[PDB]
Amino acid sequence: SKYKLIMLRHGEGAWNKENRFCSWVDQKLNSEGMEEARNCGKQLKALNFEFDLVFTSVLNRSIHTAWLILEELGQEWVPVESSWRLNERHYGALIGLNREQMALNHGEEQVRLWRRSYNVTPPPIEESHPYYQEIYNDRRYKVCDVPLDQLPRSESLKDVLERLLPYWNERIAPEVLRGKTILISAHGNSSRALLKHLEGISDEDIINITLPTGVPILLELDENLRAVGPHQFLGDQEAIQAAIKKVEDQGKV
Amino acid sequence: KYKLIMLRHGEGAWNKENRFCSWVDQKLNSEGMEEARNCGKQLKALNFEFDLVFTSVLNRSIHTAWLILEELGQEWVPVESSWRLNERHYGALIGLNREQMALNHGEEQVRLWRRSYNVTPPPIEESHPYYQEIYNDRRYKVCDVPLDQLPRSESLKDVLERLLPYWNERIAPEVLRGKTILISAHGNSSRALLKHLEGISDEDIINITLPTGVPILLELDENLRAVGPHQFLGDQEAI
C-alpha cells in the first residue's frame, strides 16, 4: 500500500544563536527551540496525526523535541526509540567554530562545500578539542553495535548515510511496512541523508537541499519504500522559504 | 545482588480537589512537576545511572520519568510504558469528590474501598461522565488484551494480578541482566509490586504508606526477593 511518515529537525539552542557548528555536542534546546517543537505539535494535531512510534537520535535536543510534540498531541504513551545512527553529522574539528567566520577565513564557497556536499570529509576531531572527552566518554555511546574506538571522528554526508541506512532498513522501514504511522525527530544532515536515499537524489543535487528548523516534513512512499514525489513541508509556504534562506545565510558574509 | 528504584508521581489539580483520578489522564500541576524535578536532582546527587525506565500509560507517570531523565542528563535511556502499571481502576468512584462520597455512602464504606486489599469498588458504567474518555482512548486499542477484557473496576488485589505478568515477563528479566531500572508508577501499582517482592501480607499491605516524589530503593537477591524492607533515599520530608 501507500505509506506516509513525518520527519523533522529540531529548533534552536544557544550555539544556533552564536552561529556555531553543533554536531555531536549535546547542546540543549533554548526557549524558542522548545516553542518550535510545540508549534510542530500543534500543526500535527491540527492535521489529526496519530503516531504509533517515534524515532530520535541520542542527542537530547532531538528527544526533547519529540517529547514536546507528543505532549501537544496527548500521545505521551507512544513508544520512543533512540539511536546514535540518527545523530547529526559529525563535523570533526569544525565543531564549536563560527560559520560566518569560517566563510571569512576560507570563502563563502569552501563553507558551502563543507556543509552541503555529499563527499567531502571534515578535518577529524583531535584529542585537543575542548569537547573531545565529553563526547567520546559519554555512557550513551557504549550500549551499541560498534566499539567506542570505531565511532567516527568526522563524517561526510556519505558516511552519515552509511551508518544511518542500516537503522532505517532494520528498524524504521519494517514498521512502515507494518502500517504504522511514524515520526522521525532528527537533524539537518541526518535527515538530508535519509531524504537522499528515499528520493534517489544525486550526489550533485543533494547539495541544494537545505532543511528548515522545526518544520514537519511529509514523505509519501510506494510499496517498495521509495518516495512518490518530493518531500513537502507542512506550514506556510513563504515563512518556510524565508526560514530556508536563513540557514543558507549562516555561511555567507 | 540487585538494586531497583521505584517511585510515585507528584500531585495535580484533582489531588488538590481531593478526588479520584484513577485511569483518567490527569496532568501534573506545577508542584507535581517540580517534585519530579527535585526527585531527579536527588538521584543525580546520588550519582544514579539508569539503563531502562518503565512507566504506566498515564501521562502523570510519563512526564515524571521525563523530568527525572532531564535532571539526570539521561534522556537517551530507553523508556517503556504499559497499562499494567496504571493506577488502580476505581470504577464508578472515578471523578467523584471524596468527601461528597463520604456523605453519600458513609465514612466506613469509602474507607474500605480505598484501604482494603480484596474489595472491588462499583464498576464504572457507560453513563459515567468519564467512561468514554477512557475506553475510547487509542492507547488501549493497541494493548496486549482486548478492550472489552480490560477491567471496569479493580481491587488492590486485582492490581497485583495484572501487574505481575508484566513484572515476570518484561521487567524481572532485565533486572537479572544487570540493568539499573527505574519504575515510575502510581501509589497502588507500586504497593502491589512491593507486596510481591517483600512478601507483605494482605494485612500489612493495607497500612503501608508510600510518599510521592521520593526514590524508593529495593534490594533483591538472585531469586529477586527483597533482602530487606524498602528504603527511601534523600532525607528530611514529613507526612
- Residues in a beta bridge with A4: A220
Helix (H) or strand (E) holding B81: strand B79-81
Quickly count: other Cβ atoms within 10 Å of residue B206's Cβ.
17
Please give the helix or strand (H or E) that residue A238 lies within, else none.
helix A237-249
Task: State this model's resolution in angstroms.
Answer: 2.2
Contact across the interface for B76 and A140, Cβ inside 8 Å = yes
Breaks in chain A after residues, C-to-N cutoff 2.5 Å: none
Query: CB neighbours of B153 closer than 8 A, spacing ≥ 6?
Result: B89, B90, B91, B92, B120, B121, B122, B123, B124
Q: What is the DSSP letter of B33?
A: H
B90 annotated binding-site participant:
yes
Q: Residues of A113-135 as b/e, b for ≥16 C-beta within 10 angstroms?
A: ebbbbbeebbeebeeebeeeeeb
Q: What method was applied to determine this entry?
A: X-ray
Chain A residues in contact with B62 (beta carbon < 8 A): 76-77
Q: Chain B residue closest to A26 (CA)?
A: B73
Angle B30-B34-B38 from CA coordinates, rounded to 5°? 170
Backbone dihedral angles phi then psi of residue A115, each to the nearest 5 degrees: -80, -45
CB distance B65 to B55 below 8 Å: yes
For residue B88, what is the DSSP state? Answer: P
Min CA distance, B45 vs chain A (Å)?
18
Phi, psi of B10, deg, nearest 5: -85, -160
Query: Residue B47 contacts by C-beta under 8 Å, 6 or more apart in sequence?
Result: none
Are the C-beta atoms of residues B57 and B139 closer than 8 Å to each other? yes
Interstrand relation of B52-55 and A182-186 (parallel, antiparallel or unpaired) = unpaired
H or E element in which residue B71 lies: helix B59-72
Phi-psi region of A171 (alpha: psi -120 to 50; beta: other; left: phi over 0): alpha
Using the Cβ of A23 and the Cβ atoms of chain B, whether some distance falls under 8 Å is answered with: no
- Among the listed residues A32, A50, A71, A88, the single catalytic one is A88
- Do the chains contact at A64 and B75, CB–CB below 8 Å? yes
- Taking the C-alpha atoms of residue A25 and residue A21, their distance in angstroms, rounded to an integer, is 9
C-alpha cell at B65: 520519568
Specify the amino acid at residue B52: L
Cell of A253: 558574509
Which residue in B75, B139, B143 has the most chain A C-beta atoms within 10 A of its own C-beta, making it the best mutation to test that interface? B75
Helix (H) / strand (E) containing A67: helix A60-73
Distances (CA, A) of B232 to A104, B156, B222, B227: 58, 22, 22, 15
Task: Report which of A19, A5, A16 is spatially closest to residue A191, judged by C-alpha positions.
Answer: A5
Whether A170 is a known active-site residue: answer no
Kind plus residue range of the DSSP H or E element containing B2:
strand B2-8
* Bridge partners, residue B232, by sequence: B216
Query: What number of other Cβ atoms are within 10 A of residue B224's Cβ?
Result: 18
